[PDB]
DNA sequence: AAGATATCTTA
DNA sequence: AAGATATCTTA
């Protein structure tokens, strides 16, 4: 399939920036430097697999706009798919992780806010997840090295793992951010998000939980603060 | 002087240099996207080697930060000097057209110019100059293919005219907020020559700081305060209230 | 001015 | 949970 393919390729799947003159700069080991270092590392692959399946790529004409691809066959352009790379880091390996998934007061609650095309113009939202173990960053790092020196640029990163999984399947109860109210996945290890170990039961529980998601505590704290206190309200009659 | 060299070091530098991409230890080139955020990260990983040049010419030892958070992106002083340290920042910003009127997010102002040891490498106290050095690019039309290493000419990159200055917090920050839930300091809007000529509001560091620990969070609880510069002094001149 | 994009630390 | 890091957008 398209996402067969794709998660596929992705796993068979950097040192530094060039310049059109030559000189390569290494790496900071800020998650602001890595975070575009895999979006980018990301583009191509995407584009290459979706022309395969005859598919459109598109990109965020406009910047603070969601997701970072826009997929989509032409016959059927009312069947859209939408792809996000997200990034986290971990110290040593095992360790539970967890991942900020997107804003609940936008595209969730408001049909055209943040977002290209109309949230129903997309049928999947998928989460191309990468994971990266922390390196202190090195004075090589602050030297700029040349064509030939390239086997020798230290990195920030050490063992990345990268998954791919639907939205909501990795979707949790907890709140990713505060104060920019961000949706926060499952805390657990990596293979389950791999295995989709989530917590909600459909796509629509998931749309369901954080559309009517408070942001004030209080006024969240006699809602409903997580998932065992949600289904009760629904037991309750809302 | 150290200053006057890392300006002149950042200007020939990034006058001949274009970062066109990102590449693999093994060979392989990716572009970049036209979005501020993958943008303001190449001006902050190309930066790093001047500074560290200039720095190391006037016997300046350098320091990024420890924790994924911190403030500033560098941190320079003496052995001989420790409690003088100074501070540098890069910020970055965008325009359309060539000649607009520009404006920068200068950091919060809950934090760390409100608590001593919050979210900055060494307590504030500690440092005596607290730079800038800002990058305005434009904007250019927007590719997604994987470019060899004897194909850096046609990479297309997606900005147009890259300027930088390096000038004082203080002496550039304004009276009005960057941002709202992320309580930023905001810039001046000015035109870029502006910032290089240090064409600010603000008397002194002095009245930049005092300003800067009273803003009330809300035009509601600004109000009955002070919501600008006029109303900061005529606050000041009514005796701080 | 007020909230969105992304992700993290502090506890 | 909340508030930091950066920058943008909308009104």
Redesign the interface.
Known sequence: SLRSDLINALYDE????????????????????L???F???S??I??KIAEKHGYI?E??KQ?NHYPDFTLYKPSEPNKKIAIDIKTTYTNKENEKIKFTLGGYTSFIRNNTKNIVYPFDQYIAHWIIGYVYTRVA?RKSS???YN?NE??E?PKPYKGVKVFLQDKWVIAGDLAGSG??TNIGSIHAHYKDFVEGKGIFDSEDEFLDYWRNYERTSQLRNDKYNNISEYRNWIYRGR
């Open positions: 950097v040192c530094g920036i060039i310049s059109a003159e030559g000189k390569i700069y290494p790496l900071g080991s800020d998650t602001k430097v975070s575009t270092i979006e980018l590392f583009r191509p995407i584009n790529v990109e965020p910047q960053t602050l030297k700029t064509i390239l086997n640029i104060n920019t």
